[PDB]
């Protein structure tokens, strides 16, 4: 009743990578290592880096899913709130009730769970091309951490997951998100607090 978040590189040496984009008030998103937090403005490009040791076999897939951080909210779906969801956004291929989009895969598939109702999105995993070191999927979260009656201000996990052509598990990674009007302010004031601390 609750996804696994725990990190596992597994054979292929799998782990995510984060742009530098820094803090200043026009950024749309920024990853904080300190607080293992990616912060980003609604619906705007996320860049997800791949990296792995070594190639996965053909048809190995890459999954990303949200659930609640806190463990008290950890069993409710995470999904878009009651206006996001009837907000008619459609990019044409994600359900409208999905938090988390691919943008720009045309080979995304988007899962309803049968047994647990939760969603996800799922793409193939690509070798990096030629001249590059890593692979990089781009995400847009469709509602912010404040929507009521949906995330409802709690925090959110993204968990990434390498998968087999069956859907076993090969890797896991994950990070924090806040979607925000201000994600540079915000990453700034949340580190401050943590050094405090
Ligand atoms: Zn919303």
Redesign the pocket.
């Known amino acids: 009743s609750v996804p696994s978040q725990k990190t596992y590189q597994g054979s292929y040496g799998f782990r995510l990578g984060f742009l530098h984009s820094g803090t200043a008030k026009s950024v749309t998103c920024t990853y904080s290592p300190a607080l293992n937090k990616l912060f980003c403005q609604?619906a705007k490009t996320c860049p997800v880096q791949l990296w792995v040791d070594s190639t996965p076999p053909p048809g190995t897939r890459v999954r990303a899913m949200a659930i609640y951080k806190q463990s008290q909210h950890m069993t409710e779906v995470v999904r878009?709130?009651?206006?996001?969801?009837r907000c008619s956004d459609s990019d044409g291929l994600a359900p409208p009730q999905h938090l988390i989009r691919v943008e720009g895969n045309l080979r995304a598939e988007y899962l309803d769970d049968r047994n647990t109702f939760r969603h996800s999105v799922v793409v193939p995993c690509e070798p990096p091309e030629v001249g590059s070191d890593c692979t990089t999927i781009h995400y847009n979260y469709?509602?912010?951490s404040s929507?009521?009656?949906?995330?409802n201000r709690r925090p959110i996990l993204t968990i990434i997951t390498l998968e087999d052509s069956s859907g076993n598990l090969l890797g896991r990674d994950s990070f924090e998100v806040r979607v925000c009007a201000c994600p540079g302010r915000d990453r700034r004031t949340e580190e401050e607090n943590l050094r405090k601390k």
């Open positions: 609604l878009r709130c009651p206006h996001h969801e469709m509602c912010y929507c009521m009656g949906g995330m």
